[PDB]
Nucleic acid binder design. Sequence first.
DNA 1: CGAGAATCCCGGTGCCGAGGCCGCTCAATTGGTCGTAGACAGCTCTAGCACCGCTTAAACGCACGTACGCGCTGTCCCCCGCGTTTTAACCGCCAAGGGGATTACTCCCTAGTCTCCAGGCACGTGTCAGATATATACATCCGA
DNA 2: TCGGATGTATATATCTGACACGTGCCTGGAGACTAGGGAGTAATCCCCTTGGCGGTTAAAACGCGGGGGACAGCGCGTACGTGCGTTTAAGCGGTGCTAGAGCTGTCTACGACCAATTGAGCGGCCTCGGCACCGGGATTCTCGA
Lengths: 97, 97, 105, 108, 95, 94, 324, 81, 86, 76
Amino acid sequence: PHRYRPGTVALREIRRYQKSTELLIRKLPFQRLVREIAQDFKTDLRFQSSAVMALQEASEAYLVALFEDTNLCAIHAKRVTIMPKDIQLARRIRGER
Amino acid sequence: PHRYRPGTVALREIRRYQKSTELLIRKLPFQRLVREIAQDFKTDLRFQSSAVMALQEASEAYLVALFEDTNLCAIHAKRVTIMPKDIQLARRIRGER
Amino acid sequence: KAKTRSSRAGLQFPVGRVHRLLRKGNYAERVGAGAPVYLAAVLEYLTAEILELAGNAARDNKKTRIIPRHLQLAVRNDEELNKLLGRVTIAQGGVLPNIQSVLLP
Amino acid sequence: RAKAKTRSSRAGLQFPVGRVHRLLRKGNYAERVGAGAPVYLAAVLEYLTAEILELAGNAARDNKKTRIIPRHLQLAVRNDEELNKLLGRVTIAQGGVLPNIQSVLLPK
Amino acid sequence: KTRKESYAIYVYKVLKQVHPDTGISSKAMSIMNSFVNDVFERIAGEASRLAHYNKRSTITSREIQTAVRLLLPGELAKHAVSEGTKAVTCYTSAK
Amino acid sequence: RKTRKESYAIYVYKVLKQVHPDTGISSKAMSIMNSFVNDVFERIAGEASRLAHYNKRSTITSREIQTAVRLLLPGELAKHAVSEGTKAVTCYTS
Amino acid sequence: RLKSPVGAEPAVYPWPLPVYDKHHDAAHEIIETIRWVCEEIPDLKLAMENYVLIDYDTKSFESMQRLCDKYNRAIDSIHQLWKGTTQPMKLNTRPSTGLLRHILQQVYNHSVTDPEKLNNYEPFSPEVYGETSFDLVAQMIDEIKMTDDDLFVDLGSGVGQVVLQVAAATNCKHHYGVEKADIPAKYAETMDREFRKWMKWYGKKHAEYTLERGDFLSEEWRERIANTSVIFVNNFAFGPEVDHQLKERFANMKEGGRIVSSKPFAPLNFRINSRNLSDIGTIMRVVELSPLKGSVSWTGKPVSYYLHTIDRTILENYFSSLKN
Amino acid sequence: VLRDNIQGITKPAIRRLARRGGVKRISGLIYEETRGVLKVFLENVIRDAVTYTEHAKRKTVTAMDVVYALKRQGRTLYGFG
Amino acid sequence: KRHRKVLRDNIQGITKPAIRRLARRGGVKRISGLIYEETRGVLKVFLENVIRDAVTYTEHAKRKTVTAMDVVYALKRQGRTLYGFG
Amino acid sequence: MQIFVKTLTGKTITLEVEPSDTIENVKAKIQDKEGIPPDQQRLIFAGKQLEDGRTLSDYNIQKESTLHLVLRLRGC
DNA sequence: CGAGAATCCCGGTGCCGAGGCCGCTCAATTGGTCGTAGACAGCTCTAGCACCGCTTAAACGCACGTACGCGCTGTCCCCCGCGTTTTAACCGCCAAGGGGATTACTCCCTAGTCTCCAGGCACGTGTCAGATATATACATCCGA
DNA sequence: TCGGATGTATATATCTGACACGTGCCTGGAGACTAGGGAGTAATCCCCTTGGCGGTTAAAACGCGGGGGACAGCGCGTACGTGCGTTTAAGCGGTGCTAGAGCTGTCTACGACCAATTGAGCGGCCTCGGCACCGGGATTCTCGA
Ligand SMILES: Nc1ncnc2c1ncn2[C@@H]1O[C@H](CSCC[C@H](N)C(=O)O)[C@@H](O)[C@H]1O
């Protein structure tokens, strides 16, 4: 019944995700999401799969930068765990909305 | 020996400074500072006093926006008082440096 | 022969001056027909929105003369123009009168 | 009746003077385009490309690789001091991020 | 003796169209002047980038419309779209 | 048969070989570098255009490119890039 | 009237003393000169504690006559020490550190007599009249053992007080210097002639130098750059035309050219490829020299001059890699 | 027409992005908050990209339109033109 | 009086209550002491960023003078646009 | 006939040379067995740069004249 | 610290993009002209620029004192780690199909030239909205 | 919870000097006509995109101890407020003043523009080799001891 303590299984594969970097997002449900949220702006929008992969890369890096600054928010709050008030804080300071 | 509690003399004149808004920065030592820090980039830089007043307005609003987001940092840290780690946090999240 | 092509489009912002800046601005080879007309119309509508928001603060402060404080409160107290002009700064006005939650004893 | 030289060799360089000059004309940037301007601009791109591929090949040899993949460009950007400040508003696909561990999350 | 072509009288006329019984300080006039040049240059550069991005050489009203729908927040953008639509319609009917 | 689209690929090849003799590039990274150089090109072109607008010219020269380089690049990056342009325009001059 | 210690011509002074400013003008200067005479061989502090006190009224010609006559009696006492069976003085000995700092400040006062028209100069060109303290130059001299062969070049000498510091410091044969802006070149001639008279008045050796009023574009300076190893100019406000031209001048030089710069010609961590064969950082080692480092200069941050030192072993090991 | 696809962004996927960003421990509301933020960001970009594609009078979304919308976002993703 | 027109110490000119004055503008109930030095450093770096740009504008316009237009265009390239001067 | 070059790497290079060989011929040979671009390769022959219009025997370069690899840098 | 749990690396196997080479444009490049754009003399004039009187608000320190920061302590609860059980992910295959690049082929829209012209911008004006002195009610705080 | 006592808007005489309104003029802005070339459309043709079937399966979803962070308060000392002398430098407002910024008259470099001329540069064809991948085995934490 060997089981690691928490934080281990965090930091190992934090290392693997920071090194092995491909998409880390299942692009078929992602692509169905993009097709749905684009369908409401205009019906019958053909894509390029290259364009949807570009969207995946952009959203990936966007949420990762948001996560990093949000992690800085939680560290500055002296909290190991991230709560979504950190996210709202970071989006307020960056001035998205 | 009438003396207010702290927080009063904060919030009154927080109201006055948010309403009565002119420069709130002594423009002659400010102007000597600007002349000094511009002198190192190039000697003998004549100004326009309008330009230096524009610098005062810009730096005023810049530091005030920094202060507001820094205050949000301290509130999110559940701290009433602002420490300069809040400033470093806010400049990191805004991505100045 | 006074013509005033903005009023010939029913407007207030100049057709010839905006067309001059488009020809000077190197924005394309040629300037289209309705392009400075539509441009001046959108400018006039946005400026009307701004001054409509400025006159409200003029009412608020018993002032018959619009000031930078009026402009500041007009821009910041908007929702969408605040989003448009968040990276935009106005001198001489100040900020919103804004007190946070946990500072009031 | 002389033979045609080339302006990049006339500049003693590697980047296309003619293509940059064509894009400056077709870019609608000014009415007219100076002579030394696309030369200078091709040099600026030459220095930037050389500087980024220096660090790209550095990261590639650090991973002992020959075909430079986007990972090494990503690391070349965000590991350099001035380049990241240049390219803070810049996102590069297929690279992921730096090895970035917040030390307070590390255990004892 | 020189010319610094401000847009002050335009602000005068629009202010008398929307709030006729109030004035303006010249400081506020310069603020609005910088505002108008900002909005102009942003929409103009947006349309110029659009003209290069679609391989064409003549920025027209549809291009400015796309530039507005890009650059402004959306509901006010649709308002300004309708305003300029009716205005260009008035330019066509009274050419 | 395809239409001769522009790219920077042979010049990235020349730069890549002249910095490292036996180093390659992935084609994704090739398109990245092409987009990068087009980005930097558009930035410097727009800034020189705004400068010529701000000083009322018609012909952007290498003076304006130098100034926009000095405006846009951070620090020692600019300090070397202007010298690269100096050498290159000097070589092109004669 | 203050003599050289070998009984030579006295440094004659006017009454009133030459007023340059209010903060540390020439009244305090003569007094500190004889405070360095107290820092010399001590046969005068016995009289300097007496009535040359810090308390004295402004424009004390009484303290001036006291100071001059006590110094004349001190030189007469050193002469009564000398004139027996004793040699007077070794000539070629050098001034010490703070002594030479006083000497350079002394040449600055007694030569630079109009900083105002020195401030009133022309627009953007390498005419930027920014100077360097005694101390970074002194530490740089400590960093670079300038021999009788390793001379110094200041193309764009300004007023060349740095060159005088190098001359009075090292064991060099000669030094170079040239200048383009007219008012500081005329005042540099004043600095030259006065400082030579000053080192006469101290009886101590200063090394040779050539300060000029001219340019660097000529092939004469190409040849002289190829001759002389150790080179510095405060190049920070010159523009990359001039600086790259000077790189091209430095290309033809000998190995180990201990060349200091202010703004560097190459990064401190420079690496070679095949592109930079035309460039200049390949054939040199680019290292940072130590600043003041307590430096409320022009810059509130320290100054941090930068040494370049010629080394083509980088490029020859690059040739070994080209074999590889 | 489609549905449920914002929850198609999965709890492991947000977890994988978090473990890339350096997140040690996640809270529960992080998932729905991140989905909402992603949805707002994607609407802002995709509306612009659709505006480009319709302005080209085309029906097919290119990579370049996404590139131009990200250029409006001050982000400017490479790899595509 | 006088010598070379050199300014050497003016960071204190952003004074202790003026920083406090701007913090009360920002709506701060209570301020630590290190905010003073930190804010002086931050403003100094920000002014370096703007003033390099404005000086560069002056050098390209080949003047000796800092106009308001230089400052406005400098802040325009900062991505923090200021109005009221052009 | 065979001459030499004392490099600043100290490589006493074997030079397959003949009096019929030019200066550029030896420069290309140094490019061959050294990898060095011959744009710069001054060789100290009694304090003279050798020029490709002449040959080895035009300078009458004696065999075992151990020259010196000088780099008149013509990236330039 | 020792069994486990990954993990680094070594080496063998194959593979599909890079990449060198092949043909064939058309865009660079030479060589001309031809207008014209900023470049430099050269000039007015105004606007920072010291300076100082001279008052003066305000900063600076300082005894107090107090609200806060935070180390700490239970506590609790909720995410984490790995396990078992689904489930579309994903990879390839077939097949249409419409949509985006192309040629072709006019067409009509704007650049440009010329000419009138009127309205925008110094310029100068009155002039009156508000700034400020002086008194006057009042949301809030000290505290019993 | 409200007496004392505050600096808090409200109100009103008295400047005043910034701000709305003629003005005049001239100088950039509005029509007539060309033309030619960007651009709109007719046609089409290939080609990438969508959609579906099927096979595998990694990967996602519940769940369940458990253990580590969140979090509530405390208390204690600390630093940060505050009125107040003091003290200190700052602003307002006079002076000249001059250095630098804006306008003008060439004008000559000096780059748009067209036309030979062709060769660098791109579409496409093997190819093969760095890398993808897999499999084995040495190497390295680890977490309950
Ligand atoms: N090419 C050149 N030839 C001669 N002098 C030059 C020059 N380029 C610039 N200068 C001069 O170099 C001087 C530098 S000012 C340096 C001051 C002094 N050397 C010091 O630092 O202590 C300027 O006055 C300028 O006139």
